Amino acid sequence: MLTEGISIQSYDGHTFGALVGSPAKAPAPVIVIAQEIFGVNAFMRETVSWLVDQGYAAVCPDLYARQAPGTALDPQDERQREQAYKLWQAFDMEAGVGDLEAAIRYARHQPYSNGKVGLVGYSLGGALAFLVAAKGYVDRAVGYYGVGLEKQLNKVPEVKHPALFHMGGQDHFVPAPSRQLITEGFGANPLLQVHWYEEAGHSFARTSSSGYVASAAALANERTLDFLAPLQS
Amino acid sequence: MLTEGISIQSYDGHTFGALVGSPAKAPAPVIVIAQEIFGVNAFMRETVSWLVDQGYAAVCPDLYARQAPGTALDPQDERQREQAYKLWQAFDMEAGVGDLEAAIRYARHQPYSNGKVGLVGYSLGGALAFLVAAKGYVDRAVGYYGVGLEKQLNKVPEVKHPALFHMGGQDHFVPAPSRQLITEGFGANPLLQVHWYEEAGHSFARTSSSGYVASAAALANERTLDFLAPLQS
Numbered sequence: 001m002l003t004e005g006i007s008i009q010s011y012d013g014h015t016f017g018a019l020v021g022s023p024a025k026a027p028a029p030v031i032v033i034a035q036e037i038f039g040v041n042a043f044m045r046e047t048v049s050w051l052v053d054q055g056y057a058a059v060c061p062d063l064y065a066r067q068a069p070g071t072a073l074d075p076q077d078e079r080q081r082e083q084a085y086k087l088w089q090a091f092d093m094e095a096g097v098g099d100l101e102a103a104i105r106y107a108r109h110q111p112y113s114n115g116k117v118g119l120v121g122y123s124l125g126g127a128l129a130f131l132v133a134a135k136g137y138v139d140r141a142v143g144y145y146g147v148g149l150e151k152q153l154n155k156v157p158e159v160k161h162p163a164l165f166h167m168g169g170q171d172h173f174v175p176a177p178s179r180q181l182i183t184e185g186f187g188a189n190p191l192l193q194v195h196w197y198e199e200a201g202h203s204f205a206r207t208s209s210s211g212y213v214a215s216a217a218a219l220a221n222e223r224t225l226d227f228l229a230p231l232q233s
Numbered sequence: 234m235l236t237e238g239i240s241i242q243s244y245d246g247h248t249f250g251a252l253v254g255s256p257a258k259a260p261a262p263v264i265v266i267a268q269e270i271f272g273v274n275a276f277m278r279e280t281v282s283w284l285v286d287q288g289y290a291a292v293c294p295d296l297y298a299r300q301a302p303g304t305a306l307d308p309q310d311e312r313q314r315e316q317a318y319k320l321w322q323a324f325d326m327e328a329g330v331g332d333l334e335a336a337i338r339y340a341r342h343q344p345y346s347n348g349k350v351g352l353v354g355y356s357l358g359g360a361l362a363f364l365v366a367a368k369g370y371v372d373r374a375v376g377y378y379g380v381g382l383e384k385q386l387n388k389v390p391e392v393k394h395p396a397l398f399h400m401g402g403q404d405h406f407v408p409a410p411s412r413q414l415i416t417e418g419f420g421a422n423p424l425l426q427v428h429w430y431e432e433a434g435h436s437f438a439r440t441s442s443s444g445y446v447a448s449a450a451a452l453a454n455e456r457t458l459d460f461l462a463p464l465q466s
Contacts (some may be wrong), residue, residue: 011286012258027309102286105282105283105286106402108275108279108282109275109276109279109440110280110440111445112439115275115278
């Protein structure tokens with residue numbers, strides 16, 4: 001589900017919708033939320049609603065608009081899960097970064113915006129979070145269980161704004177050898193933080209997933225909130 | 234907010250900072266952006282990011298540097314609005330034209346520049362846009378709701394480059410007698426266009442204004458982009 005009437009235009013003219021929520025007290029900092037491979041679905045409505053509850057406005061752009069606008073898939077349905085993976089196969093990461101840039105610019109100047117913008121991404125959106133952080137588009141970036149961070153370690157010296165990453169210690173969609181590489185690579189730049197959650201698997205912050213761990217989700221979420229707090233007026 | 238390490242020297246040796254953005258495709262035409270009465274603040278940033286995402290480079294000089302460098306005031310805050318008016322009172326218009334000329338001259342030869350330079354100004358900057366157009370510094374100029382344009386009519390003949398003006402028809406800074414004089418005087422020079430937006434008052438393109446008018450904002454902005462497009466390669 002996207003918010004009726006919301007349209008955001010990318011640098012290349014492509015337009016996409018978004019799910020938007022904002023607290024009744026404005027102005028407020030705005031968090032752009034980068035989706036998983038499942039589109040702007042229930043977990044995205046959950047995440048938007050949590051951030052609103054915590055005094056942020058939120059914008060979750062339809063990053064699948066180039067491929068299948070309005071895609072919202074249930075990761076617990078087999079056939080829908082398979083379709084998500086196929087959409088991921090074809091996902092253009094450089095265009096995703098560009099669409100996030102457009103959503104971030106949008107976020108800056110809404111009537112409710114206080115002018116500060118953070119980004120929080122999950123899985124696919126966690127990798128996008130790191131790419132956005134290296135570009136420097138946002139005041140602060142957070143990625144949960146980003147994929148393939150070990151392939152991006154060359155960009156570590158580009159990160160010039162605070163960024164926070166949450167990784168599962170039991171997430172076997174990360175090759176075991178990647179852990180040290182990411183930890184050591186990130187350890188070179190004090191603006192980058194990476195936390196490991198030794199009991200948690202992939203998608204550990206999402207209740208619909210079998211990797212869910214409540215205590216790890218709550219700790220990662222507290223850290224996210226504490227890290228984003230400076231954006232607040 | 235200004236861009237670190239950008240220092241531009243003016244005709245009298247006074248130096249000022251600027252907020253700069255360049256698009257992904259360099260070189261591009263550069264637009265110099267003349268501020269409102271609040272310094273290089275959130276709306277100036279919005280404008281830089283907008284023009285860049287439209288294919289322009291953009292330079293917004295700190296025109297308050299002679300009085301209070303790095304001034305950036307929130308129009309929705311009473312005390313900050315009051316200080317903005319006091320700065321506005323002491324603002325030396327001729328010096329401000331000189332500073333804009335310096336910015337324009339600087340914009341001609343940067344690695345990101347295609348050699349073509351336009352100017353877009355708002356409020357205070359909308360009057361400066363007229364004065365700069367009368368000097369002939371720039372290739373094309375645009376002013377939104379310039380204040381005191383009626384005092385400047387003797388310069389109408391001097392304008393030898395195209396200039397576009399977006400004026401609110403309910404702008405308390407442009408009471409009725411003035412509107413007609415401006416409409417009359419500009420009518421004399423085919424290079425000047427002025428549009429009137431009957432629903433709109435001062436500041437109608439700034440979303441933080443109680444006077445914001447989405448539909449007039451959209452119309453004027455689309456006209457602005459059409460009018461600037463000939464600078465592009």
